[PDB]
């Protein structure tokens, strides 16, 4: 049923029905077969969009909570709504991390796929960390950082600095340093190192790779501009 699941995933993608897309790609993943680049991207798109809504909603709700007087009787309802959104986000991240640990990382055959999946693990533990507190926050930060670090080492060893997966890994890991570990200097250096090292071999990428890698490099420079001011 792989082919029909993929057709339906792409159809749901065009309709922006990302729950359906996530279900399709979750079924494709649970079939045990290693995913192709297209299928990896479909799964990533699906779950990125499924969790981004919760993340944005959580930012809005928590913001409104900070601006609410601590003695306001209406505060507990805001807290409960934030906790509901947090629970949905935790469910999504747990589904994705289970897919990663049970199927994707396990059956990843080449270092490109392994970097992609370990980076995804870092991303979703980072999403958990965004909304965590206390010991849970420490543990999620450690998991995210470990995933990012293993992916980073494998990418430095096996992939060229122009590869868009390695570049996006550097981007997300720098974001992790800036937003989670709260070290803007090391975040800047990580982003700037990836950016600078990518410039040289740009003349070797193909069309799609060039477009992706330059998009990621532009995001790196945007983050550098924002962080240093």
């Amino acid at each position: 049923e792989k082919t029909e699941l993929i057709q339906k995933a792409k159809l749901a993608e065009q309709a922006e029905r990302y729950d359906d897309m996530a279900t399709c790609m979750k079924a494709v993943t649970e079939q045990g077969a290693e995913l192709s680049n297209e299928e990896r991207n479909l799964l990533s798109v699906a779950y990125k969009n499924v969790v981004g809504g919760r993340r944005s909603a959580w930012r809005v709700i928590s913001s409104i909570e900070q601006k609410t007087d601590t003695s306001d009787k209406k505060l507990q309802l805001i807290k409960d709504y934030r906790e509901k959104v947090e629970s949905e986000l935790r469910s999504i991240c747990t589904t994705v991390l289970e897919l990663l640990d049970k199927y994707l990382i396990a059956n990843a055959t080449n270092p490109e796929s392994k970097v992609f999946y370990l980076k995804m693990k870092g991303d979703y533990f980072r999403y958990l960390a965004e909304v965590a507190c206390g010991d849970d926050r420490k543990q999620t930060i450690d998991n995210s950082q470990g995933a990012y670090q293993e992916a980073f080492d494998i990418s430095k060893k096996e992939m060229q600095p122009t590869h868009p997966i390695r570049l996006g890994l550097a981007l997300n890991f720098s974001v992790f340093y800036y937003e989670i570990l709260n070290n803007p200097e090391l975040a800047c250096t990580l982003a700037k190192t990836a950016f600078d090292e990518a410039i040289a071999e740009l003349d070797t990428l193909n069309e799609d790779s060039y477009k992706d890698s330059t998009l990621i490099m532009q995001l790196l420079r945007d983050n550098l501009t924002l962080w240093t001011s």
Binding site: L171, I216, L219, D222, W227
Partner: peptide, 7 residues
């Protein structure tokens, strides 16, 4: 806010 990959 910082920008992460469009993934």
């Amino acid at each position: 806010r910082s920008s992460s990959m469009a993934a």
